[PDB]
Amino acid sequence: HHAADYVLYKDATKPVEDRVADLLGRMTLAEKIGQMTQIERLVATPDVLRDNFIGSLLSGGGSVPRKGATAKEWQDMVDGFQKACMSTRLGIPMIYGIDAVHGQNNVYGATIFPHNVGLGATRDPYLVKRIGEATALEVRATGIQYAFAPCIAVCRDPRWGACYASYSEDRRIVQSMTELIPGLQGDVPKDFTSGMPFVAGKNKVAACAKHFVGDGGTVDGINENNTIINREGLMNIHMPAYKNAMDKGVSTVMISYSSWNGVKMHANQDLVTGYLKDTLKFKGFVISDWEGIDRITTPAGSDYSYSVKASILAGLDMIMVPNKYQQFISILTGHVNGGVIPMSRIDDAVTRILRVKFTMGLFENPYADPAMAEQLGKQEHRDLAREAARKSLVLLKNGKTSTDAPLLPLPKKAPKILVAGSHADNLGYQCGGWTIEWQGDTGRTTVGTTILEAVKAAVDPSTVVVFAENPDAEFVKSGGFSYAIVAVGEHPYTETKGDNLNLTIPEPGLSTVQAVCGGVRCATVLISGRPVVVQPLLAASDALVAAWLPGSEGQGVTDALFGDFGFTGRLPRTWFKSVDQLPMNVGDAHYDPLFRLGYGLTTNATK
Numbered sequence: 001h002h003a004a005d006y007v008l009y010k011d012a013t014k015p016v017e018d019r020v021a022d023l024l025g026r027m028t029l030a031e032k033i034g035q036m037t038q039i040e041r042l043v044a045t046p047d048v049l050r051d052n053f054i055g056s057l058l059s060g061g062g063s064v065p066r067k068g069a070t071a072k073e074w075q076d077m078v079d080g081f082q083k084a085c086m087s088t089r090l091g092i093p094m095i096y097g098i099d100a101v102h103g104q105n106n107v108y109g110a111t112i113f114p115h116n117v118g119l120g121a122t123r124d125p126y127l128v129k130r131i132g133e134a135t136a137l138e139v140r141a142t143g144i145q146y147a148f149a150p151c152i153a154v155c156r157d158p159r160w161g162a163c164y165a166s167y168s169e170d171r172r173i174v175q176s177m178t179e180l181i182p183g184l185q186g187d188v189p190k191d192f193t194s195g196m197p198f199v200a201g202k203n204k205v206a207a208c209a210k211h212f213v214g215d216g217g218t219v220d221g222i223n224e225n226n227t228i229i230n231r232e233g234l235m236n237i238h239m240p241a242y243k244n245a246m247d248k249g250v251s252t253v254m255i256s257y258s259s260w261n262g263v264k265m266h267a268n269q270d271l272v273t274g275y276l277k278d279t280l281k282f283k284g285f286v287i288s289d290w291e292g293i294d295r296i297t298t299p300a301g302s303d304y305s306y307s308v309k310a311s312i313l314a315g316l317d318m319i320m321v322p323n324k325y326q327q328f329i330s331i332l333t334g335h336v337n338g339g340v341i342p343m344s345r346i347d348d349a350v351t352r353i354l355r356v357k358f359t360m361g362l363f364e365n366p367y368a369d370p371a372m373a374e375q376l377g378k379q380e381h382r383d384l385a386r387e388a389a390r391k392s393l394v395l396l397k398n399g400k401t402s403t404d405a406p407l408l409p410l411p412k413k414a415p416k417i418l419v420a421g422s423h424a425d426n427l428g429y430q431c432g433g434w435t436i437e438w439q440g441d442t443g444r445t446t447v448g449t450t451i452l453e454a455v456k457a458a459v460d461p462s463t464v465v466v467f468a469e470n471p472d473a474e475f476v477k478s479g480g481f482s483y484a485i486v487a488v489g490e491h492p493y494t495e496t497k498g499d500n501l502n503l504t505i506p507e508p509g510l511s512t513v514q515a516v517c518g519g520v521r522c523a524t525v526l527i528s529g530r531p532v533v534v535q536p537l538l539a540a541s542d543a544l545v546a547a548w549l550p551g552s553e554g555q556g557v558t559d560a561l562f563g564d565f566g567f568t569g570r571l572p573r574t575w576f577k578s579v580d581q582l583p584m585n586v587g588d589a590h591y592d593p594l595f596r597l598g599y600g601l602t603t604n605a606t607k
């Protein structure tokens, strides 16, 4: 169609399948294998990207151009890399991915949304769609096209270090929350074939349903471990939300480190090719997790030639290497040259990778849009995160006896009040893992509002607000306080670091609560990624709120504490009496919860 130097795959008006086919048929083996390779920005240079025809880059947690980098520094870094890829013979743009799992959370100044567990407590799929929408804008503000989200694991044992990344122990809740997909990507057209990949354009990002499959069902919630359950249980609990993801056009799927009945997901041909591709008809690309193929073996990385063969024959399209690309590429090249991996397998992986790229508009907008930079931490997004924070809170107790005046909502006008606790004035702690660093961090790590700051923002100008991190019982008794707000709970963690068999919060926590509540009426705010041993904290407290990991917008906490809105959150998980009961899920054997799934007390808005 026209000028003599015309190349079909470069023609923006052509159908995606035709462009895919036209480009694929021009490619060398090297160009093909390069598309299947995703590398860390830490090992990328212009020469490496060109010489190896690299298909994709990522930032792992905390992999940033520098601390405190602006939206525009992110764009320039991404464009720098894109420039190199666009200079190859074929000029295939790379796609850059990142873990934007509660906002664009590696980035300084990015809005930080509550983690998924508290989103589950909202029972509000449309709220979650708006979060996907705002997250898309803030990822594009940094010039990135692909978010590794949503995690649609169904956590069945809160001892799991990634339990907070699961919306619920109940698959129906997880299914409903797959509305993050068309928020991140855009709504699919009414026509739309299930399993097709979709992204609306340059103001959206490709999403990723992860981690396929049963990552939530591991023995004793050990991370990356074995999920032991018959096919029926797998299909009834852990598989369903994958189909909702197919119907909403999720562009990519990430495979689990975990195994199903002793079989590593990263080597599972039956599930990856047989079920996901051949039965659900998924047509986007399938991506490994980080060194996912290495971990097929024991020890990890002890037979990488086998890691490559088994993962690629299982049906994975793109490998998150992410460091040793030369080895990955060499080994995959040798296996193809030797006839051990047929060309049809390579061609299918590349068809799928290219189909996502063409579909999302990546050949038409390979470069960042500088006018999107101001989306980062936009106040409208913060307002949305604040709403989400507030709706996620679950009120577990509001008064020690049925006859006490209920403590909450607290009055904004009082002569003198106490705010106390390790978590009352610690932004890092209220955000939890995957914020700025991989493991999260402590203190003022980004822009936001701590519980202390939110309290001072909320109260009457005549209310004197006293902060004390760990006050003793005397200080409280002598302080002339009207009430206290005390915030305690878990430290930040992610995945294996967070596997925890005792689920009891660190001290000083309980002791501060006892000291405070022994002197004056107290509202205890529990910051956690999951249910934790809570009876002693309940016994001390007049009122107690499960706030999960509410993110950067602490005024969501105080919006409810002070009665601007009623509490509406409901437990998206079972609250256990003791860890010895675990695992224990709604519908189970002898199901004996402290608070059942769906439990939450309510209040009404003041005035």
Ligand SMILES: *[C@@H]1O[C@H](CO)[C@@H](O)[C@H](O)[C@H]1NC(C)=O
Binding pocket: 222, 224, 225, 226, 259
């Ligand atoms: C699960 O964890 C145990 C205990 O650390 C380990 O020996 C075993 O290899 C793991 N099983 C997996 C990953 O399938």
Ligand SMILES: *[C@@H]1O[C@H](CO)[C@@H](O)[C@H](O)[C@H]1NC(C)=O
Binding pocket: 499, 500, 501, 502, 503, 504
């Ligand atoms: C609970 O387990 C965590 C990590 O698994 C550990 O840091 C903490 O000290 C433990 N508490 C106990 C054994 O009381």
Ligand SMILES: *[C@@H]1O[C@H](CO)[C@@H](O)[C@H](O)[C@H]1NC(C)=O
Binding pocket: 603, 604
């Ligand atoms: C909260 O609203 C409901 C319905 O209007 C009512 O049952 C309850 O008594 C209300 N108010 C308070 C202060 O508890």
